[PDB]
Amino acid sequence: PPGPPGPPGPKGEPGPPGPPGPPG
Amino acid sequence: PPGPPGPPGPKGEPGPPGPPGPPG
Amino acid sequence: PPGPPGPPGPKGEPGPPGPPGPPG
């Protein structure tokens, strides 16, 4: 029989920068 | 033997909204 | 035989804060 499934992959990338803040 | 590590995970959430615009 | 690929890795971190908003 085939061996065990591999480990979880690496963690994904950080998400994008947030959007602009509110008008001053 | 165990299989290979899986694919990288998905990207994270967009970051928090930015700060308010500057005073004045 | 080698096991198959593992599952997808964890979801990434939130991104950095967005830019300061417009001047008022």
Give a nutshell description of this structure.
It is classed as biosynthetic protein. Keywords: collagen mimetic peptide, Triple Helix, biosynthetic protein. With 24 residues, chain A is mostly loops.
SSE topology:
3 copies of one chain form a homotrimer.
Chain A: no helix or strand
Keywords, separated by commas or semicolons:
homotrimer, 0% helix
Structure description:
3 copies of one chain form a homotrimer. Chain A has no helix or strand. Chain A is largely without helices or strands and 24 residues long. The first copy, chain A, is rod-shaped and about 65 Å long. At the A-C interface, loops of A face loops of C.
Oligomer: homotrimer
Please tally the helical runs of chain A, counting DSSP H or I stretches of 4 or more residues. Answer: 0
**Spatial separation of the terminal alpha carbons of chain A:** 65 Å
Structural class of chain A: little secondary structure
PDB class: biosynthetic protein
Keywords: collagen mimetic peptide, Triple Helix, biosynthetic protein
Assembly: trimeric
Entry title: Crystal Structure of a KGE Collagen Mimetic Peptide at 1.68 A
